[PDB]
Amino acid sequence: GTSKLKYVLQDARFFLIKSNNHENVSLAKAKGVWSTLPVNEKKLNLAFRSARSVILIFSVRESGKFQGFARLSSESHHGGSPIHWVLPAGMSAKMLGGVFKIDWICRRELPFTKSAHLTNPWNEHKPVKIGRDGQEIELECGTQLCLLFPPDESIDLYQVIHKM
Template identity: 60%
Template sequence: MSGVELDLACPEIDVDDFSSVSKESIDSQSNQMQTRITQENEQYKSTLTNTIQTPIEVQSIPIHDEKQTGALQNIFHDTVYFLIKSGNEENVSLAKAKGVWSTPPANENKLNRAFRQHRNVILIFSVAESKAFQGFARMSCEARHDSQPINWVLPPGMSNRAFSGVIYIDWISRRSLPFNQTLHLFNSWNENKPVKIGRDGQEIEPRCAETLCRLFPSDPTIDILSISRKADKHKSSSRSPLSINPSKDINHRSSTSIDRHRSDVTLYLIIINRLTNLAIIFYTNLNQYRTLQKKKDVG
């Protein structure tokens, strides 16, 4: 558990070694053992603390209108976030111009499921090797298969058949955000890696993702109120009995809580083990001390 090896073996004690034990030596050994245990526990607690991500400080997009601020907050309510990776800038530019996106079937199914289960699904775009995010958008509907295919710029040998349908999106910011402004953000649903790291379709922990979205420069070309109204309309259809469970990848969401639980259990076992060893030493020494006292009284 958590890479900590427990030494559960009790120390071997030779009774003859205590033939000349004095009360002072017993107290000295007990104090030394207690000091060592305290130091080990403090060191272990320090290690655990350093592995836990520090609280994320939420920053605000510089929007001065109260209605726009409320609309943005509405978009961040009951929201799931996904990282979208593009192999080239041309496809993201096309997505910004047409308000559409396409993704392989596995990702499409995941996004469709999230859209049915939540009020908002936010896609955060990043072009490979660009060292930046290129903006973020809200899904306005599930992928459609009755729309005209988009002429995406694809690698040689790949056709549009690799993509299932067309996802219509509403851009919230088309502005870029350099990676060097997001170095303090880590995705706990991706092994606490920097938020910039992730495969196409990687889900991002909501607090981290919201903070990331708020770092994007405000986009004056966006009608944020209209997008918020769409979120309100979608709200009534996102709570059907078949979709009460949140969209989640159990492996990504639960790993952090499991690791912390294991760390707590490991620390508890270490403390119990050390205290047990201390008790054994103390009572053995005490018995030897009493034996010596009886011999002195008899003598």
């Protein structure tokens, strides 16, 4: 069912994550972590302290889909075991901010064709699929996007609800 999902999404904030490649989303799915540029790191840390749930929705550029979404379980922290991201061409690992711990809520994909009726008021009401890495999605658009995903029956939101 979708009731616990709606509970988790209640009054959440949502951020669009655009990844250069699948390997980074797969690393994120396996390790439960994400690391972003400092400009987005600062926004996520502010948002983490401000709301009951901060949701990251991932899209690999040129894939035509979202690859799932996850909930921030910590602020960014430095000094962990280094994560072997496949960084974009001109980018080095030092340019990255700290590491966020995340809990996955949905590891299934969703094609953009399924979200074409959703527009993000925080990006000029363009379709929610359009946006730079780190673009915030307004509450209602964000919730309806997450509800479009196929249910991920591998996941139990009971532990996530304990985190809030």
